[PDB]
Amino acid sequence: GTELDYDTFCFYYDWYGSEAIDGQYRHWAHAIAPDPNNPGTIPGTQESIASNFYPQLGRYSSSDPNILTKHMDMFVMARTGVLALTWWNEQDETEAKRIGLILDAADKKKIKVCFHLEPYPSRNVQNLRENIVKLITRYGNHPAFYRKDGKPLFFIYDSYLIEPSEWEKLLSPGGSITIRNTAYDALMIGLWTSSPTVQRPFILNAHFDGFYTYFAATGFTYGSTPTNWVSMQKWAKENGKIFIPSVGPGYIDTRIRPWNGSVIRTRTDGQYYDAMYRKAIEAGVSAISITSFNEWHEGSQIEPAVPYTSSEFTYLDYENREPDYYLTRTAYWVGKFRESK
Ligand SMILES: OC[C@H]1O[C@H](O[C@@H]2[C@H](O)[C@@H](O)O[C@H](CO)[C@H]2O)[C@@H](O)[C@@H](O)[C@@H]1O
Numbered sequence: 001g002t003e004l005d006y007d008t009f010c011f012y013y014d015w016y017g018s019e020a021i022d023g024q025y026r027h028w029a030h031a032i033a034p035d036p037n038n039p040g041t042i043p044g045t046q047e048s049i050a051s052n053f054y055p056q057l058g059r060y061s062s063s064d065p066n067i068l069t070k071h072m073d074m075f076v077m078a079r080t081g082v083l084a085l086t087w088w089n090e091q092d093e094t095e096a097k098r099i100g101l102i103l104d105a106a107d108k109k110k111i112k113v114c115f116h117l118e119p120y121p122s123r124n125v126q127n128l129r130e131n132i133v134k135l136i137t138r139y140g141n142h143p144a145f146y147r148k149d150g151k152p153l154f155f156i157y158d159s160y161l162i163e164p165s166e167w168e169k170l171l172s173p174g175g176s177i178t179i180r181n182t183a184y185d186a187l188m189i190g191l192w193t194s195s196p197t198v199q200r201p202f203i204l205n206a207h208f209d210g211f212y213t214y215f216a217a218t219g220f221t222y223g224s225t226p227t228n229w230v231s232m233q234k235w236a237k238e239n240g241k242i243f244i245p246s247v248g249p250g251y252i253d254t255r256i257r258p259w260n261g262s263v264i265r266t267r268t269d270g271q272y273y274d275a276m277y278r279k280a281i282e283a284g285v286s287a288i289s290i291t292s293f294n295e296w297h298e299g300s301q302i303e304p305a306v307p308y309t310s311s312e313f314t315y316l317d318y319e320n321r322e323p324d325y326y327l328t329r330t331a332y333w334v335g336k337f338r339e340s341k
């Protein structure tokens, strides 16, 4: 009843800084997005951070070993066995440092780490192959590196930005630059966004091993509408694909995207999280992803948050629930998922 689940993947962000470690409050300070249809910047002061909520751990650094210890203890409380790490191909010493610290901290608690491959500049199947080789070579022998039946696993955000004819070269067994049957073979999980008429042939022709949905906001896409999950799972099973639906506790991003209020999803003291997690389990899936551990900008985090009012903003909080409620409610749902496996 307390063991970690290694079919539960929680999306984790390593881009936060503090004065203590980095010399700068990175990401707590953030540009405000212009409306797609001179917006300014959130300064990352104690009073004004780039979130509608306020972390229990304050304006922390993702490179602070003491913060990382606490985060791994939170994963243990939630029973979430896999940390799905955002990866932007920064190619700098700070990226390399933080990945190594995260792997070391995870292994102390028997947590595993996989990579979430983001839409970095000029991403294409050739530099993706080179980067998959780099990550497996650098980190594949670390004891915390995740494998499922011998294979690493990668999530690919906004995979539709690359044509299926390009994906086939990397992911078909006959592809020109294939990883299949090589030392670098891996489970590749693409993003299902829109309707089945578009997504079914995309996923088949790209040769993905499976698909996920990402968005914590119900109805944002066809794929993030949970009443579609039973039929998506049936299609996955008939076609030998792994479906990993994404569940989250709520959504609100209006500090950084003030024009995006129609995407707000209220937490209702945990009832929103309960409804989404129940739908994933009832669909009969073999793996679940959680959006998110700590995407504070988008208000999808399960990490503990505290009440806070400053001279500049009155933050949202988890009241009438306690700061660790979303960790303990995740553990409840992991138990119900395991009962169904
Ligand atoms: O939310 C601000 C954040 O947006 C973009 O990153 C995305 C978000 O973190 C979220 O939607 O999840 C995506 C998948 O993990 C991720 O791409 C970036 O523009 C980022 O720079 C920005 O801070």
Ligand SMILES: OC[C@H]1O[C@H](O[C@H]2[C@@H](O)[C@H](O)[C@@H](CO)O[C@@H]2O)[C@@H](O)[C@@H](O)[C@@H]1O
Pocket: 158, 193, 220, 221, 253, 257, 260, 263, 298
């Ligand atoms: O516009 C804000 C929005 O940006 C991102 O979503 C975009 C894209 O990445 C998604 O694939 C499609 C799905 O239809 O929607 C947008 O174009 C996300 O960061 C999202 O959370 C955010 O609200």
